[PDB]
Amino acid sequence: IVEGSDAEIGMSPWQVMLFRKSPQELLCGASLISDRWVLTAAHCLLYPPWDKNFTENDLLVRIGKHSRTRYERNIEKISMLEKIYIHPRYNWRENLDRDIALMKLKKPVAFSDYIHPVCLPDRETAASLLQAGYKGRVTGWGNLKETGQPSVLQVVNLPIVERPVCKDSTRIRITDNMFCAGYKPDEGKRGDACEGDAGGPFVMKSPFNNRWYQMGIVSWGEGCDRDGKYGFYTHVFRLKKWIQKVIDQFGE
């Protein structure tokens, strides 16, 4: 995250970290939606142009963390992967549409004050909250600038942007399955998700039930915290039929 600030303990209990076994490296972020299902970006697990293509084996998910680094002794929980599920129609060559993947934990995690799950929106909340101007929460352990990493999980609140503006900032073929957020040039407030952030969540808090809903997945962009530019996120709502298909197919 660029232009954001230090999270607060237990402020993002569904914040999950996708970790590399060896080389032991952090590769992305993701969120917890049940005690055995984790959501992330497909490109976190499979992105050819990088010769990326991991298996439920090369990886580990670390749950309940604050430090980017310390082993948080009674506080974190290390988990193994059962199956990884990439969207049958996730396009990496062209626009990164349907940048989404589910991962089933070999074992269900035990909720705590630092571990608990975010909610996925229903039709109605999507219309309510997904409106140009409304703000979102994007948390990550990603870069502190386009071109380091924080000591602690970072948070930045940003507003959804209007379709046409999104389309006007980039040459990429923006689809119905993504959304854009960050400030406009004329608004003089910044912040954006940067590298090490995809998979991580874009959440909003309903004024109706006071629950956090996951409205997007940190996906992609041109640069980071660039005037005239917008962070792009996967439309969680939009791709729910599939999340739901694979879930009550392969777990729960």
Binding site: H43, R93, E94, I172, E195, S219, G223
Partner: peptide, 10 residues
Amino acid sequence: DFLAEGGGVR
């Protein structure tokens, strides 16, 4: 081309 048009996966 995400890459070609400058695409920055994160």
